[PDB]
Design a protein around this nucleic acid. Structure first.
Lengths: 209, 175, 142, 59
RNA sequence: GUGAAGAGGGAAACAACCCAGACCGCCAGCUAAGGUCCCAAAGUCAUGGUUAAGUGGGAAACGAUGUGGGAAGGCCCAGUCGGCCUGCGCGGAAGAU
RNA sequence: GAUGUCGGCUCAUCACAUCCUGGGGCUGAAGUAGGUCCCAAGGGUAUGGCGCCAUUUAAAGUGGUACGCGAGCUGG
RNA sequence: GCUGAAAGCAUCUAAGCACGAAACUUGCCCCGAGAUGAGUUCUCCCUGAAGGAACGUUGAAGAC
């Protein structure tokens, strides 16, 4: 079924009554509004496309303004779309609230992780380190050997080396939901969601058991 | 060959619908159809279906022996039916016939399996099961379904076995 | 004087439809690759394409002889470190029938730019309804 | 090149290439392959008469 | 005998294997070794059989009711039995980008 | 008119003639624990001391790749 | 394993049919129309437009 689009705020703890702390995180959600509904007889898949937030008058181009004005809804920060779950039907202009997550109790959170730049091999792939004394010269963190001699002649595809690390889309599964506040529009979920503060997080019900 | 040439009497209460290579004997116990090997030429005459070979075909009478042999069940089992018997010796395994469902508990979870339409099971005693049906190939398969759970272990004979089957017990390793 | 060479601008091309129910693979692909190259015209020239457009229907109904139904294996290499992929005939014809025809005709044609230019003509379809009805193709019996 | 040209133009009329050359050799005609190919390209009306004569002379 | 001191065509590629010894030219013909379904010029040719293993397209001692043809038998009012010569097959048969 | 040699560190790749884990036949296989063979290469396979010892673990498999790897390190 | 002849019986097989592994194709996560087969849908502009780029304040983005 369909999820929500929110914004990570911070990380805090929650005290249960028996004296056990629970490390949670807080996701702020504004009321998502349905801008488009697709169906099988025109495209080939059933899915809804929603928006959230608010944007300025100048920064929105003309065709996006017309496309939003067809549905009669206000502007938004970004557009996302969720695959419909084969037997739900929702109209155009309906606002998807936060009350929907009062029963699922098992969600997965999808987001963009941090980015650590051009990180080396030891930070990326967890290599090991050569000796720092006993004659070792000009080699403390290099990868080392990378293959054979006069037989393959080529380094095989998929070799683990240096590169850009982080800034990748990722998904953390099987996170317990803890507290849903439909009056101040918040969602407190136990665990550690990916991404820095101020990003965009996608919350879906867990596709596994 | 000698089983092929013998005319088997096909009694009334049946239909002989040769719909080409396919045969329908819609009657007392349903139908059984199958593209018949293009070799076995069949022909309806009188209370029998005459099989011969068609030219250019390698098996010929070899396949006609099958056409008279396995489809002798087509002659007989429609009006007579067939009945199988099973027993079990040794206590500790329970398989119960709840309708078309068979449930079973053996010291393991209980496992389930299913019974087809034209098969009826009766238990005149707590240990003996009698199965009535329509087709030889179906009752043999449900026999392989029922026997495979607690197959007869050959030391103390415990398990589920047939009524007429013999199983030879032996010693238990003196030294 | 000289032997005439067939110019590319003045050439003419037709459209054909080939039914493939119950045919064997090799003795159909041979005629397809013969007509696509343009060897059945009296205007043949080995460096100029002169073939004919061909549409093939009922590709899933093609048949093969003997135990090639199961024994014949199709391989490809992913190019990666240690992977290689295989598939039998049944799984491939269940997944897609277009690649079975398009991998057999491809080997029978020359290699190079003219090979791809010739292969661009053939257009196979899995079912029995083609979407090229506006060009008025002629039914050809092979 | 010429052999393939004559072979296609002869198979268009219902006779393979080998029987074509066999019939022309038996009918005492010594036109070689270049003139045959050029005639087969430009004017089919003479080529079908040549093919018909070869078919008559073969059998 | 060939190469060294020899090109051409065939054996996928392949100095020493098979056919054959290049003075120069031409958009002419007949053949040798090898071949005629497409890549790649020429038979989807004609008559009678064999193989069902992709055998053809790698191999031994040994083994088995695979299959075609032939000679000689023992018993028998509708056949059965296992011995011999012979053509084609099957198992024996596991390598590292 | 030059193809740098054994062991160790870092990094691996592949085969199966299989050490563990999964499926079975036979057993001189009551059970537990075993012996051998058939199928199976997806994952894993220890630390110290001078071939052996001490102690863990389900396990501490057999092998080519210039007896892998010095325009990567070590000079024992 | 079931039925079943060639070989009157028997037989997992020659014809059809049912089970059967951390293995195989799916399933789970990510990339993905330079897939030249270059795909799909919604809106906007044209009888100097829609927009894009240069410049500036910069970032939990970053070697440029």
């Amino acid at each position: 079924m369909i999820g929500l689009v929110g914004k990570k705020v911070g990380m805090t703890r929650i005290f249960t009554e028996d004296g056990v702390s629970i490390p949670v995180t807080v996701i702020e959600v504004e009321a998502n509004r349905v801008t488009q509904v697709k169906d099988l007889a025109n495209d080939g898949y059933r899915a809804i496309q929603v928006t959230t937030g608010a944007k300025k008058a100048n920064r929105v181009t003309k065709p996006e303004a017309g496309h939003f004005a067809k549905a009669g809804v206000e502007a938004g920060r970004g557009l996302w779309e969720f695959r419909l779950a084969e037997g739900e039907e929702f109209t155009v202009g309906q606002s998807i609230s936060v009350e929907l997550f009062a029963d699922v109790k098992k969600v997965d959170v999808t987001g963009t992780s941090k980015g650590k730049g051009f990180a080396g091999t030891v930070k990326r792939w967890n290599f090991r380190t050569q000796d720092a004394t006993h004659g070792n010269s000009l080699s403390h963190r290099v990868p080392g050997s990378i293959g054979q001699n006069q037989t393959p002649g080529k380094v095989f595809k998929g070799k683990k080396m240096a590169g850009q690390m982080g800034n990748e889309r990722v998904t953390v599964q099987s996170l317990d939901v803890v507290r849903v506040d439909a009056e101040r529009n918040l969602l407190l979920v136990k665990g550690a969601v990916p991404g820095a503060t101020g990003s965009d997080l996608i919350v879906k019900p867990a596709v596994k058991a | 060959s000698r089983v092929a040439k013998a005319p088997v009497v096909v009694p009334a209460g049946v239909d002989v619908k040769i719909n080409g290579q396919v045969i329908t004997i819609k009657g007392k116990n349903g139908e059984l159809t199958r593209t018949l090997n293009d070799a076995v030429e069949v022909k309806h005459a009188d209370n029998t279906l005459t099989f011969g070979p068609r030219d250019g075909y390698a098996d010929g009478w070899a396949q006609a022996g099958t056409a008279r042999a396995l489809l002798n069940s087509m002659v007989i089992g429609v009006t007579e039916g067939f009945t199988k018997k099973l027993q079990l010796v040794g206590v500790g395994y329970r398989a119960a016939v709840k309708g078309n469902v068979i449930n079973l508990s053996l010291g393991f979870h209980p496992v389930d399996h299913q019974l087809p339409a034209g098969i009826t099971a009766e238990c005149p005693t707590q240990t003996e099961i009698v199965l009535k049906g329509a087709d030889k190939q179906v009752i043999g398969q449900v026999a392989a379904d029922l026997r495979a759970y607690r197959r007869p272990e050959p030391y103390k004979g415990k398990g589920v076995r047939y009524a007429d089957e013999v199983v030879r017990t032996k010693e238990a390793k003196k030294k | 004087m000289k032997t005439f060479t067939a110019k590319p601008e003045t050439v003419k091309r037709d459209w054909y439809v080939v039914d493939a129910t119950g045919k064997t693979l090799g003795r159909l692909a041979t005629e397809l690759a013969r007509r696509l190259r343009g060897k059945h015209k009296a205007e043949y020239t080995p460096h100029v394409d002169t073939g004919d457009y061909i549409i093939v229907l009922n590709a899933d109904k093609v048949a093969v002889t003997g135990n090639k139904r199961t024994d014949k294996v199709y391989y490809h290499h992913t190019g990666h470190i240690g992977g290689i992929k295989q598939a039998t005939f049944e799984e491939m014809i269940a997944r897609r029938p277009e690649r079975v025809i398009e991998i057999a005709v491809k080997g029978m044609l020359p290699k190079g730019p003219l090979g791809r230019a010739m292969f661009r003509k053939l257009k196979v379809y899995a079912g029995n309804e083609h979407n090229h009805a506006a060009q008025q193709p002629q039914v050809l019996d092979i | 090149l010429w052999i393939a040209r004559i072979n296609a133009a002869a198979r268009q009329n219902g006779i393979s290439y080998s029987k074509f050359i066999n019939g022309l050799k038996k009918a005492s005609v010594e036109i070689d392959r270049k003139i045959l190919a050029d005639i087969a390209v430009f004017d089919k009306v003479a080529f079908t008469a040549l093919v018909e004569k070869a078919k008559a002379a073969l059998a």
